[PDB]
Amino acid sequence: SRVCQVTGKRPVTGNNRSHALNATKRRFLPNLHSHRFWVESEKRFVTLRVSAKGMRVIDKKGIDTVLAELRARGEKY
Amino acid sequence: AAAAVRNARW
Amino acid sequence: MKRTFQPSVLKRNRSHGFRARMATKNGRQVLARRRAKGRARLTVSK
RNA sequence: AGGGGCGUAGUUCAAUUGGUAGAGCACCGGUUUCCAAAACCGGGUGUUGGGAGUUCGAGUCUCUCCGCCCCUGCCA
RNA sequence: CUUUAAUGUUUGAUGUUCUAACGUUGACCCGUAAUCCGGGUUGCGGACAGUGUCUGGUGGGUAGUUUGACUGGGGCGGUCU
RNA sequence: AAUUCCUUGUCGGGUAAGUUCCGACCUGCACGAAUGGCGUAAUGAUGGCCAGGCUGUCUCCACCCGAGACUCAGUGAAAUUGAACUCGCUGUGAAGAUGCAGUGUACCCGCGGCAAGACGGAAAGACCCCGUGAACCUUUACUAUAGCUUGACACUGAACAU
RNA sequence: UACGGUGCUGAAGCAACAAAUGCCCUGCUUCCAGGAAAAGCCUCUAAGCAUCAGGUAACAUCAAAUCGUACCCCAAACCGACACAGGUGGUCAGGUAGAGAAUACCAAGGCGCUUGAGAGAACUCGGGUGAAGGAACUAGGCAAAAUGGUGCCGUAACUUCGGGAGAAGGCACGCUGAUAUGUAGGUGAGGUCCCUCGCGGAUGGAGCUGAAAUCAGUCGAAGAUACCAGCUGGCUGCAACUGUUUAUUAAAAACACAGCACUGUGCAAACACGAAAGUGGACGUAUACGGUGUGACGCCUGCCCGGUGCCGGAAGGUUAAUU
RNA sequence: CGAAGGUGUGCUGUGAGGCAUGCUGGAGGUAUCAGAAGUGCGAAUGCUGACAUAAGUAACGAUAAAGCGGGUGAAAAGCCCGCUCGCCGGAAGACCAAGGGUUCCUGUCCAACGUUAAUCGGGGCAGGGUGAGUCGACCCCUAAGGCGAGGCCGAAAGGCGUAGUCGAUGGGAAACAGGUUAAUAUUCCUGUACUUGGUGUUACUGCGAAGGGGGGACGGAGAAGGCUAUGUUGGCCGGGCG
RNA sequence: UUUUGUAUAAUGGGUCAGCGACUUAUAUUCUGUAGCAAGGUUAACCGAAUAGGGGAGCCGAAGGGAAACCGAGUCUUAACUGGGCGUUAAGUUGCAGGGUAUAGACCCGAAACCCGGUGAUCUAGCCAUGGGCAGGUUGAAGGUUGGGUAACACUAACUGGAGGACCGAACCGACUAAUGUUGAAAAAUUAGCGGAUGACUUGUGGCUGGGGGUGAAAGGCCAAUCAAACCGGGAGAUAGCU
RNA sequence: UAAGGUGAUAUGAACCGUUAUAACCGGCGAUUUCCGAAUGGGGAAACCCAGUGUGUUUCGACACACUAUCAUUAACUGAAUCCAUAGGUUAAUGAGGCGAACCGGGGGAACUGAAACAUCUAAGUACCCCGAGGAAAAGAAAUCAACCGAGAUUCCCCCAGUAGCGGCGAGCGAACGGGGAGCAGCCCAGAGCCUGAAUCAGUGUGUGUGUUAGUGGAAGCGUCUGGAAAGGCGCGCGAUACAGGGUGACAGCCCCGUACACAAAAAUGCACAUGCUGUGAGCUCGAUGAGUAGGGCGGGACACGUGGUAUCCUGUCUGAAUAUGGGGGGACCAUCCUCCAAGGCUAAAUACUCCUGACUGACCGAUAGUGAACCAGUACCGUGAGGGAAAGGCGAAAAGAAC
Ligand SMILES: [Mg+2]
Ligand SMILES: [Mg+2]
Ligand SMILES: [Mg+2]
Ligand SMILES: [Mg+2]
Ligand SMILES: [Mg+2]
Ligand SMILES: [Mg+2]
Ligand SMILES: [Mg+2]
Ligand SMILES: [Mg+2]
Ligand SMILES: [Mg+2]
Ligand SMILES: [Mg+2]
Ligand SMILES: [Mg+2]
Ligand SMILES: [Mg+2]
Ligand SMILES: [Mg+2]
Ligand SMILES: [Mg+2]
Ligand SMILES: [Mg+2]
Ligand SMILES: [Mg+2]
Ligand SMILES: [Mg+2]
Ligand SMILES: [Mg+2]
Ligand SMILES: [Mg+2]
Ligand SMILES: [Mg+2]
Ligand SMILES: [Mg+2]
Ligand SMILES: [Mg+2]
Ligand SMILES: [Mg+2]
Ligand SMILES: [Mg+2]
Ligand SMILES: [Mg+2]
Ligand SMILES: [Mg+2]
Ligand SMILES: [Mg+2]
Ligand SMILES: [Mg+2]
Ligand SMILES: [Mg+2]
Ligand SMILES: [Mg+2]
Ligand SMILES: [Mg+2]
Ligand SMILES: [Mg+2]
Ligand SMILES: [Mg+2]
Ligand SMILES: [Mg+2]
Ligand SMILES: [Mg+2]
Ligand SMILES: [Mg+2]
Ligand SMILES: [Mg+2]
Ligand SMILES: [Mg+2]
Ligand SMILES: [Mg+2]
Ligand SMILES: [Mg+2]
Ligand SMILES: [Mg+2]
Ligand SMILES: [Mg+2]
Ligand SMILES: [Mg+2]
Ligand SMILES: [Mg+2]
Ligand SMILES: [Mg+2]
Ligand SMILES: [Mg+2]
Ligand SMILES: [Mg+2]
Ligand SMILES: [Mg+2]
Ligand SMILES: [Mg+2]
Ligand SMILES: [Mg+2]
Ligand SMILES: [Mg+2]
Ligand SMILES: [Mg+2]
Ligand SMILES: [Mg+2]
Ligand SMILES: [Mg+2]
Ligand SMILES: [Mg+2]
Ligand SMILES: [Mg+2]
Ligand SMILES: [Mg+2]
Ligand SMILES: [Mg+2]
Ligand SMILES: [Mg+2]
Ligand SMILES: [Mg+2]
Ligand SMILES: [Mg+2]
Ligand SMILES: [Mg+2]
Ligand SMILES: [Mg+2]
Ligand SMILES: [Mg+2]
Ligand SMILES: [Mg+2]
Ligand SMILES: [Mg+2]
Ligand SMILES: [Mg+2]
Ligand SMILES: [Mg+2]
Ligand SMILES: [Mg+2]
Ligand SMILES: [Mg+2]
Ligand SMILES: [Mg+2]
Ligand SMILES: [Mg+2]
Ligand SMILES: [Mg+2]
Ligand SMILES: [Mg+2]
Ligand SMILES: [Mg+2]
Ligand SMILES: [Mg+2]
Ligand SMILES: [Mg+2]
Ligand SMILES: [Mg+2]
Ligand SMILES: [Mg+2]
C-alpha cells in the first residue's frame, strides 16, 4: 500500500473547500517514488518506496543509519 | 395485492 | 407456470452452504449473528 | 376574445422621440439617341390612420376610436 | 540625471549532446516444473514521460438543492413599497 | 399527407346516398433531402378502403343437444354490516329523503326472477388544488465534485551553445 | 391347493417381404460462419539403474472399498398456500388408414378425473340446424359460416428476373373386372457355370412385395364422402425483408437489421471496468477497433459557419499557483 | 359462620358513586388519613381473541360415463371381486435424471385430514422393505469459472493474479439372459462371461521422467448405400367346427 | 368527527372482552403552601450514613453607564432648572401545581434519504459443455454431357443440394374472440394464430449487485416488489396535514 | 454425605444398597467420535482422498504417530555471478478463531433542525475496520498563573449557559479559579568510584484470610368449627432464631431453614513473611533527543466556522538555535515571569456486565413481564440475509372414574 518505508507516511483524509465553504471528503497521499539506493557496505542497490520528504532524511541520516532503524522496525526492506 | 383498476375518471 | 423456485441441491449448497458462508467474514458475521440469536440451524447444510 | 406591434410622399422604408420629416424607386422638366429605353442635369410632393386631451407648442407625449399585422384562449 | 558602449554577476528562455535518476506491456539469463513477480545482462527512451502537493480552465459525468405569494380553482395575464 | 387549423377544401372515380378510401389540384395554418427526400418487387397475427364467395352478424329470432341455474340429501364460504318495527308521492331540508311535514297506499311470511334506488360493494381519488412534501429526469438554474487539461515545485542530473 | 399358487411335463420355435428418426457414420460429399481441453492409452529417449530394479509373456492367486439403490417422477408424492383444468429435462415409439411422431379408431398398458340423485323454467355457457334475404349488423365482416387433399390443365399487372404463384380458374377421384387370374417396378431362392476358393463372382428366374394408368361395368343426392385440411381478388399508407420488444391491458409504423457516411483510434491504441495493480478492447493492428447518426435496393442528398460545439492557429490583449 | 370475583335485588347521594343483601364461588380482603400513578375508553378504515351477518345462499375444481351382481361391514353411488359400458393410447402408457423423503408393502383404526359418506386412502398407528468388481456416485481428467503460496496493488477491510488446487453439463476398465418377493433387483438366485490392480512362480529380457511425439480430438448441412430394432404375410405347432 | 351549516345521501365503527394516547428528566418563570429571614440555602463528597459534617458556590440586600468609572445616585452634555434608568416596597430554600425550554415530548401514519449486508434456483445478457427440430415442397452456386465460339461468353439436358426459403407437428412464441374476474389459475383454459435449420430452442453449471447490473431499448428486467431490489440499522427520520 | 437409589416427560421392568466401595455433592485426573481457527490434501460443514515413519502378520492387511499457513530465531544447502545475495530444505518457539458492553485508533453518513436551503446543525453520532485490557486511555510541565503563587494524569460538583464561536441565524460552548475522589514517581540518550546494596520480576516455603462440598442449630399442648387447622377459644414456651419457604384454611415452637457456632483430603484466589533465580541502589563528573522547532501552501483538531487568531496534529515545499540557548504567556513587539519539546515507563480514583452468588423493589402478574412463565428464536414464512408466533392454573392427595 501507499506507505513510506522510511518515515511511515500514509494517506490521510481531509476536505475540499470552496468559495461557499462546501466540504467534500478527500484524501491526501504521500509523494511516493520507488528508488534504488546504493548501500556502500553491501556494495548493492536496494530498492525502497520512499516519499520525497523521506528522500531528504536519507541524505541527512546516512543510508546505513536509516536501514538500521528499519531492521529494528522489522519492515522487511 | 392488486393493480389499480384503470376505471380512472380523468 | 414456472415460478421463482426451482430446487437444486448443488446450487443451494454452493450459494448458502456452511463453507460458502464461512469463506468470507461477511458470511461469518451471519453465522456470528445466528449463533448470538441462538438459531437451531446455523446454516442451510443438512 | 385577450395581449403586443404597425399606420410618414405614388409604393417600400428612415426618423427626430416636444420647437424646421428625410432616403430609394416612381412622377414631372431639360440633355443625350433617327426613336424608345439605359445614362446625365434639375425639381415638386406629407392632415405623419381618425378623434380627444396635456403642453406656450404634438406626426412625436397620454387615452379612446378605425384599419393592418403578431401572439395566446391551457389541465381535468 | 539622462544616454547609456562595454564589463562580471544573478536569475531565467530555448537549442544541441550526454547518462546516472526514472520508464520499458524490447531481447536474454536465473529464482523455476511459471506468458505473474523479482533479480541480473543488454538494447531503446531519458531529464522527458509518469506520479505527489498547489493552481487556472473545462466538466449534468455524478451529486446536494432551489425554482414565491395573492388570485371568485390553478395556470397565463396583472399585482407586491 | 401518420403533417391541412379553417375543412366534410375543390374536382373526378367508386355507392341509390361515401365527413373514410383512390386520382388529381396546390391555397405546404405548420413537407423537404442521411434528426434523409422520393419511388420500390417481395414480406406483414401492419393501418384504411372496395369486390366476389360465404354465412343467425342482422331483418327476427325459433327449435334442439349438453353444462349450470331450480328441487332433494351431505358438506359448507365470501366481500359487507351504527342500530332498524327498512312504502309511494309532493314539499322541505349540509341545497337529489325508507326515517322530517302533509297525504295516499299497504293482512303476516317465503320461493324463483329483473337490477331502478339504498348518492350500492371494492380501494384514506389517479383528474384538480394544496404542503416553504418525496422522488427520478433535463438544462447556457445555483453551489460543488469525479474525470480531463494547464503551469509551478518535488522525484530531477551534467556539459555546451546562443 | 388358501380364487393366489405349488410341483411335473411341455409341441412348433422357420421363411419371405416391408422397414426406421436407431447402427455402419467420430464415415462420405459439400459449404463458410472454419468448428474444447486434459488425462487414461501408445511410443521415444534423458538423470538415475544397467548382477539388481524394472519391462514383456504364461499360469496360480488375492482384491475391487465406500455411498446411492424403496416410491413418485408431465404428477394427488416436484415448483405453484390446495389431493390446484398451470409449469417441469431425457429415454422407449405397436396395429389400420395416412407423406407423417398430424389425425381417427384400437393393442400392450392405464384410467372414468372424491359430492351425488332428480327435474327438464327464465337466463348464462359449450354446441347442432334453419324458411327467405345475404353485411341491411357493427367503430370494424368482431365472431361464425365458407375455403381446404393429390394428380393434371391453366395462370395477370408488376418485378430487384428470384418472384408474384398453391396466382386466379377448372377437370379427374368410390367399388368391381379387364389390359395384367396378383401388371410395370422392387426383392430374389433353386439350378448351372467360374474362382488364385469365401460372409465369393456371373448367370438364372421360382416365390414374395407392389404402384400408376387406360377401358368396361356398377351403387348413392353426394366417392379428397368421416377426422384431417389455404377464403380469394383489387387500390393504398408505413416499415425493405427473417427477427426483437413493454413476464402480467400496447407486437406496432417502435427497436434491431444488412448497407451508407462522419469522426476518434499507430497499439503501453482510443475507449471502458477499476482509488490502484490489472483486465476487456485483442493474443486483434487502420482491408482493424470504438463512438455517433441514417437504415436493403433504385434515383438522389441542394444553400447557410451568424449562433452553439468541434478542429486548426498564436502575434497581441487578459489571466492562477509561484517569486 | 364464607374474602375477592361474578350475577340478582333493595336502599341511598347533586353526580362520578356508596351501603346491604339472596345466589355463585372457595381464599383471601382491607377501615381511616396520607403517599405514588402503566388512575377511568365507544369511536383512531385502532391492536389481539371470540362470536355474528349475508346463509343453509355460492361452491363441492375440466361435459372422458357410467351400470349391475356378489362380498366385507353397524351402515356401500364412492371399498373389494366379477361381467358389461366409456376414455387415453407420441399418452392420461412404460423407464429415468433433477427434486421430494418413506408417500413404497402388510396389518389395524375412522377423531382430525379427503370439499359428501367411507369399511377405503398418498390420513393415524405398528411392523416389514432399498443386497452391485461391471448401473450411477465416489475416483482419474480437464471447460467456463472459483479459490489462490509467494507476488503486485490498495486508509484498514481488501482487489487482482503466478505456481498450483478445485470445479461436469464433457473425456476415462469391465455383464448379459432367465428365475424369484406382499413390497428390491444388469444388485438376490441359476447359467454363461468380462475388466483393472496386488502377490507369487516360470521363461525371455533395457528400464526409466515433473520431459518429447502420437493418439484421445471434436462444425453445419446434405446425399445415398448396407443393415438391425420392429412389423406384416406364409409355413409349422396347438386349439376351435361355432 | 369535521364544519358557516349534517337525519343528512359527508368520515368512523359487524359485536363483545382485553389493551390503547399529555408522561419522564433537568433547568427556568409564576401561583399556592411550609420554614427561616436581611439573609436564605448547600452541590459533589465525607459519614453508620434519610443524621451530622462540607457555605465550594448560588440567589438577595444598589444602581447607572457601551465601558473606564461613579454611586442613592447615575448616565446623557460644556452644563443641565432638564430628561432616561434607579432610590419607601423581603427575600431565599423546599413541596405541589400552571407555563416555557431541551430531549421522540400526547398517541398512531408517510412517500423517501443515508449506512452495512442478502439476492442473477425467476428474469436479461454473456461463458463452458450436452440435447432437440415428424413429414412434405421449392431446386441456387457448382459439376457432367451436348449444342454453339478461334477460345470464351451463351444455351439445353442431366446431375447436384444452397436458403435468418416454403407448407406443417414436437418445441417456442402469445395476434383475435369467448369464458373466467371472491377463478381450476394472484395472467389461465377453449377455438383459431406466428415462428418452426435458425438473429432457433433447451438442459446442467458459471459470471455481471442496487445509482449498480443487464437491456435487438419498453424505463423493460434484476426472486408475484423496480423512474433506483430486498434485509437490518440511523429510527420513535420528519409530517404547519388527517 | 448417606438409607435409600438407577436424570425428565414417565409409568414399568430388572436390579443395586442400608454404617459404609448404593446413590448424590465437590476437588483432582482419565476418556473426550465427526464437523468447526481446523492445521495432511480436497470439499456441497459433520464428508472424500492420501503421504511418511514406527510397530504388528493369519501375507488379506492392521494399529498409532507425524505431515496447514504465517511470524521470529538458529543451523544446512544454495542461482543468474567469483565471492555473496535472493531463493530452498529442516528444527525450535509464537500467532491464528470466538465472545455482551466498556476502551484506543483508522475511516465516516443522511434523515433532521435552521419552519426552504448550500455555510452550519444533526455529529465525529449511526455504521464499517484494526488493536488491547480487566479496565483501557492519559500521565510526571518546553503546564498554568500573574509580579503572589501553584506543582503529573484521570473522575465528580461548581465556575457557567459565563467569556466567546456562529448565514453573529439555528445552534455550539469553554478556560482560569475553587470544592472533592485519588495521589507516585522514575528510566535512557554515559563513563567512572563503589558494589549486589534498594526495588522489581520470576519461583519454591510457611502463616493468615477467602473460594470450590458440608455440620449442628432453640421452644405447644388441650378444646371448638371444619373434608383437612396453621383459624377460634384457653393455658404455655423459645428468641443473638418473629428473614423467608413448605406443610389439607392465616405456623416463632410441624418441616426446610434463619440467628449464631463450627468444617477441607485436594485445588485455587488474595495478603504478609521468608529462601533462591534474575534485577540493579548510592556518589562524582559529564551529556541534555535536528530534517526537529519554526516558516510557505492545503486541510484538520482545539468551545473558537480564517477571522486581527494564538496553541496542537501534518499532505506538500523548506528549514534553525542548540544552555553564552530555546518554548510559552490568544495577532505582534519590548520588558518581566515561567518552563526545557523533538526518547520512554508508571498503580490508584474512572467506564462496562456475556457470566457467578446473595439480597432488594409504592416493578409486571399470562393481550402484562424478555419474542419466549409451556421442548421459543421453536412451529411457520422467505432463494437468502432476515422476520417470527400462538400456547400457564383438576384436586390436599390421581384417589384420573372398578362395574
Ligand atoms: Mg394533464
Ligand atoms: Mg441534478
Ligand atoms: Mg436535505
Ligand atoms: Mg399559489
Ligand atoms: Mg383533418
Ligand atoms: Mg367527392
Ligand atoms: Mg389523396
Ligand atoms: Mg421531417
Ligand atoms: Mg444536408
Ligand atoms: Mg439532417
Ligand atoms: Mg415479423
Ligand atoms: Mg394491407
Ligand atoms: Mg363480400
Ligand atoms: Mg331500505
Ligand atoms: Mg322518494
Ligand atoms: Mg325529494
Ligand atoms: Mg330472494
Ligand atoms: Mg338479473
Ligand atoms: Mg343484472
Ligand atoms: Mg405554495
Ligand atoms: Mg416398483
Ligand atoms: Mg398435476
Ligand atoms: Mg397461488
Ligand atoms: Mg402443493
Ligand atoms: Mg415442456
Ligand atoms: Mg394424436
Ligand atoms: Mg337445458
Ligand atoms: Mg352471448
Ligand atoms: Mg354451425
Ligand atoms: Mg336433424
Ligand atoms: Mg337462413
Ligand atoms: Mg337457404
Ligand atoms: Mg352498414
Ligand atoms: Mg345501423
Ligand atoms: Mg375476422
Ligand atoms: Mg368452422
Ligand atoms: Mg397474389
Ligand atoms: Mg391516408
Ligand atoms: Mg417490419
Ligand atoms: Mg403485456
Ligand atoms: Mg418474452
Ligand atoms: Mg400482447
Ligand atoms: Mg431509423
Ligand atoms: Mg461556427
Ligand atoms: Mg467562422
Ligand atoms: Mg388485588
Ligand atoms: Mg352479594
Ligand atoms: Mg382449595
Ligand atoms: Mg393506560
Ligand atoms: Mg368519543
Ligand atoms: Mg365472517
Ligand atoms: Mg342445501
Ligand atoms: Mg339470497
Ligand atoms: Mg340459489
Ligand atoms: Mg348450486
Ligand atoms: Mg371432481
Ligand atoms: Mg357397489
Ligand atoms: Mg378412443
Ligand atoms: Mg407418514
Ligand atoms: Mg399404498
Ligand atoms: Mg364418523
Ligand atoms: Mg399412511
Ligand atoms: Mg454383486
Ligand atoms: Mg451398496
Ligand atoms: Mg459405467
Ligand atoms: Mg498471498
Ligand atoms: Mg484470485
Ligand atoms: Mg479434481
Ligand atoms: Mg458427468
Ligand atoms: Mg426400482
Ligand atoms: Mg464435414
Ligand atoms: Mg429382423
Ligand atoms: Mg351515513
Ligand atoms: Mg365501514
Ligand atoms: Mg415556594
Ligand atoms: Mg445533609
Ligand atoms: Mg464564600
Ligand atoms: Mg437622574
Ligand atoms: Mg412543573
Ligand SMILES: [Mg+2]
Ligand atoms: Mg408537553
Ligand SMILES: [Mg+2]
Ligand atoms: Mg424459414
Ligand SMILES: [Mg+2]
Ligand atoms: Mg410453418
Ligand SMILES: [Mg+2]
Ligand atoms: Mg368479460
Ligand SMILES: [Mg+2]
Ligand atoms: Mg413466413
Ligand SMILES: [Mg+2]
Ligand atoms: Mg418483478
Ligand SMILES: [Mg+2]
Ligand atoms: Mg434513491
Ligand SMILES: [Mg+2]
Ligand atoms: Mg429497510
Ligand SMILES: [Mg+2]
Ligand atoms: Mg437520528
Ligand SMILES: [Mg+2]
Ligand atoms: Mg414515525
Ligand SMILES: [Mg+2]
Ligand atoms: Mg484436514
Ligand SMILES: [Mg+2]
Ligand atoms: Mg429544514
Ligand SMILES: [Mg+2]
Ligand atoms: Mg487478564
Ligand SMILES: [Mg+2]
Ligand atoms: Mg443441618
Ligand SMILES: [Mg+2]
Ligand atoms: Mg531535551
Ligand SMILES: [Mg+2]
Ligand atoms: Mg496551516
